[PDB]
Amino acid sequence: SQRMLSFSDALLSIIATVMILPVTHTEISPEQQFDRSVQRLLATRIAVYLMTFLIVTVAWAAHTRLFQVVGKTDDTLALLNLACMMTITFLPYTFSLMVTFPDVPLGIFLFCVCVIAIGVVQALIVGYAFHFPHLLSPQIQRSAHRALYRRHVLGIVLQGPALCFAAAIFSLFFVPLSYLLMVTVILLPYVSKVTGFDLHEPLSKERVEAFSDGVYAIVATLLILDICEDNVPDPKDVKERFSGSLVAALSATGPRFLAYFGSFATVGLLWFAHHSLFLHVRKATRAMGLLNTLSLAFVGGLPLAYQQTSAFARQPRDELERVRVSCTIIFLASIFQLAMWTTALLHQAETLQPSVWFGGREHVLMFAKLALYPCASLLAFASTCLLSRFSVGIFHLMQIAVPCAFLLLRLLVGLALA
């Protein structure tokens, strides 16, 4: 039913951040001046993770549309969806393999086989669907119609794997330069025919909500995912710390614990802003999901920043650029959430059900609730005008503290009306 999408999107959420693990798992230890090559590696892994989320979310969106055109499902449909998931989950690893092995044919060959498989599987789940129009087709407009939808939906589903088969036969047998014929497989679902039926309708609100909640949950506890399996003090530590006194050898994990606490607090607060926004969103538009994807990507990036902030690498005097990085990451991951909300200029009639319209009941409330994080990150970014850059700690402390008394911070403006 609609429940089968819950698992098949929680799985996609947890597969959309599988490539974030090597970002945090790599060390930033100053043991060598290799910081040049280490940074060359960190930027590579970041560019691999950001091109993984933005290649899994589009698959998730094609999948969510296809399951929006097959609304009611049964056993065989659940099996075919499971197969489609088994194929989609192979996207991050194979994409990493292709990026790390560019000039070798097998890499992009496997990546294009990986996308061809999910394409043909979805084609199967839509053919089996349209062979049972009474049972599995969504509604009357898709049930009783010209019955010509099959052609258009098969096209919109198979264009991915077909363009891919083209890019694969052209891939590296000759001229491995036109494999941009692959990178154009992402634009067509998002926008190519909009500027160049109507199955291109915006996603369902519940689906993007569940995906965002999944990717917030995983990226919050991503730190505790290793602070638990690494920082067990290893009772052989009796020789370490010159003595026993478990608290002594445990205090070594103090920086990582202060990194976690902050990372989870910030990710949970960003999730709270996202949830207070999506609680009033009536019908998530296309631009809504487009902004949400990037917001989620930078949120997924965030834990690396929070880890780098609470590290004490060498020459830690002119290396205060770490707070600049950990603040620009927050400023991106939250300014995109704020853009999601400010995309209500004239769509407020359709979207944003009338409780937060221009001059609504709690308009300023949610507005400032969402704009609280970009401004708070900007305030810390402004540390370039002073030297006490450690103010980031106290600032994010009061930041987390605000949303409690922030109903009354709004009453402050209410009384400032006069």
- Of 16 and 62, which CB lies nearer to K ion in the complex structure? 16
Structural element, H or E, at residue 369 = helix 363-381
8-state DSSP, 344: -
Should residue 10 be labelled a site residue for K ion when binding is judged by CB under 5 A?
yes
Q: Is the dihedral of CA 307, 329, 368, 353 positive or negative?
A: negative
Residue type, 54: L
Q: Please tell me the number of Cα atoms within 13 Å of 351 on its side-chain side.
A: 23
Among 131-139, 217-225, 310-318, 353-361, the segment contacting a second copy (CB under 8 A): 217-225
> Is 213 an interacting residue with respect to a second copy (CB under 8 A)?
yes
In whole angstroms, the minimum distance from the beta carbon of 289 to a second copy comes to 17
- Is position 228 an interface residue for a second copy (rule: CB under 8 A)? yes
**Considering the rule CB under 8 A, would residue 378 count as an interface residue with a second copy?**
no
Binding partner of residue 117 among K ion, a second copy, none, CB under 5 to 8 Å per kind? none
Closest distance between a second copy and the C-beta of residue 257, in Å? 9
With respect to a second copy, which residue has the nearer C-beta, 25 or 145?
25
- Least separation in angstroms between CB 84 and a second copy: 11
Q: At closest approach, how far in Å is the CB of 159 from a second copy?
A: 27
Q: Which of 224, 371, 375, 409 binds a second copy (CB under 8 A)?
A: 224
Site string for K ion, 12-51 (x = CB under 5 A): --x-------------------------------------
Binding partner of 254, given K ion, a second copy, none, CB within 5-8 angstroms per partner class: none
List binders of K ion among 179-238 (CB under 5 A): 210
- When CB distances are held under 5 to 8 angstroms depending on the partner's kind, the choice from a second copy, K ion, none that residue 413 binds is none
E-strand ranges in 33-154 read none
Residue 235 found at the interface with a second copy (CB under 8 A): yes
Within residues 7-36, the interface with a second copy by CB under 8 A covers 7, 10-11, 13-15, 18-19, 21-22, 25
DSSP annotation string for 297-311: HHHHHHHHHHHHHT-
Residue 76 vs 184, nearer CB to a second copy: 76
Separation between Cα atoms, residue 77 and residue 70, nearest integer Å: 9
Among 225, 368, 371, 379, binds a second copy (CB under 8 A): 225
- Nearest to K ion of 14, 83 (CB atom): 14
Query: Residue written as tokens 């059900």?
Result: 353
CA dihedral of 328, 330, 335, 341, whole degrees rounded to 10: 180
CB 108 within 8 A of CB 171: yes
d(CA 171, CA 106): 10
Check residue 398 for interaction with a second copy (CB under 8 A). no
Scored b (16 or more CB within 10 A) or e, 119-145 reads: bbbbbebbeebbeeeeebbeeeebeee
312-371 positions binding a second copy, by CB under 8 A: 369
User: Which of 41, 47, 86, 252 is close enough to bind a second copy by CB under 8 A?
Assistant: 86
Structure tokens at 56: 């899994």
394 binds a second copy (CB under 8 A): no
* Rounded CA separation 90/111 (Å): 9
Query: How far is residue 120's CA from residue 171's CA, in Å, rounded to a whole number?
Result: 20
Q: Which of 82, 23, 28, 17 is nearest to 55 (CA)?
A: 17
